[PDB]
Design a protein around this ligand. Structure first.
Ligand SMILES: Nc1nccnc1C(=O)Nc1cnccc1N1CCC[C@H](N)C1
Length: 273
């Protein structure tokens, strides 16, 4: 049973994603996160190779499963009569990117470069494994404060990556691209790159560039903080109105603003000490 295998701690958060609790695996004292999701609230249903219908997140997290620290690890999962329980890895000490930016304001470009690079490495790993996250944002990024390593969380709005159009979306509207707003249509990679541009603006400015549909559609970027010309260029390129004008992950990582990234441990030493 789940109740004998894990010691339940405080609620870490709840919302559209369900309810997430801090926990401890009783056997080895390993820190875990216990995620509960009600069956009636599930947006994307997946199918396990053995045939059983599970939340898409269970399918997606199994697809990415490796020694790669950039994606939160699924440790175990359970079915209950009206819900699913997901046992996830829990870094300690940890802080999500949203709380980190709230406490510190706009980040130094060196810090933003290190964090953005790790998000890109994590997203590239998902895509290479046939997984599309669909809800890339500061709230879905965990910072391992000791190691300076970032992890992607919440694959509950995700899908299997495909080359055809998506007509469904249940991620964050303010991170969604203008083709979703205008037409209820987007392609995986170019929509992911748009959300990445919103994320990078958020990191260097301390807030998102757009709040309303009209602003997303217009796509005019205003810099409220001092941001280098190379960083402003990368942001505007990710935020191109025409999806095909957006850079590939390779063009992003080869961008001159992305050069000479710090190692995660150098990041923890300089910026998280
Ligand atoms: N593994 C974790 N370790 C520490 C903290 N959180 C998580 C987590 O999975 N969180 C999570 C999963 N699915 C949806 C939302 C989640 N968050 C809950 C805490 C607040 C965070 N912004 C979102």
């Amino acid at each position: 049973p789940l109740e004998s295998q894990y010691q339940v701690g405080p609620l870490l958060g709840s919302g559209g994603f369900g309810s997430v609790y801090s926990g401890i695996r009783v056997s080895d004292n390993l820190p875990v996160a216990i995620k509960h999701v009600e069956k009636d609230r599930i947006s994307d249903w997946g199918e396990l190779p053995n045939g059983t219908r599970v939340p898409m997140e269970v399918v997606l997290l199994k697809k990415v499963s490796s020694g790669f620290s950039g994606v939160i690890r699924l440790l175990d999962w359970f079915e209950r009569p009206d819900s699913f329980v997901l046992i996830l890895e829990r870094p300690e000490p940890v802080q999500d990117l949203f709380d980190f930016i709230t406490e510190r304001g706009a980040l130094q470009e060196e810090l933003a470069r290190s964090f953005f690079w790790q998000v890109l490495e994590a997203v590239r790993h998902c895509h290479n494994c046939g997984v599309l996250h669909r809800d890339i944002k500061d709230e879905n990024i965990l910072i391992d404060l000791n190691r300076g390593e970032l992890k992607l969380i919440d694959f509950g709005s995700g899908a299997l990556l495909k080359d055809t159009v998506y007509t469904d979306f249940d991620g964050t509207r303010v991170y969604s691209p203008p083709e979703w707003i205008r037409y209820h249509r987007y392609h995986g990679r170019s929509a992911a790159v748009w959300s990445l541009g919103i994320l990078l603006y958020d990191m260097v400015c301390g807030d998102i560039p757009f709040e309303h549909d009209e602003e997303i559609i217009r796509g005019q970027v205003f810099f409220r903080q001092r941001v280098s010309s190379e960083c402003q260029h990368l942001i505007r390129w990710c935020l191109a109105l025409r999806p095909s004008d957006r850079p590939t992950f390779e063009e992003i990582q080869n961008h001159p603003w992305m050069q000479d990234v710090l190692l995660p441990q150098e990041t923890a030493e300089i910026h998280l000490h």
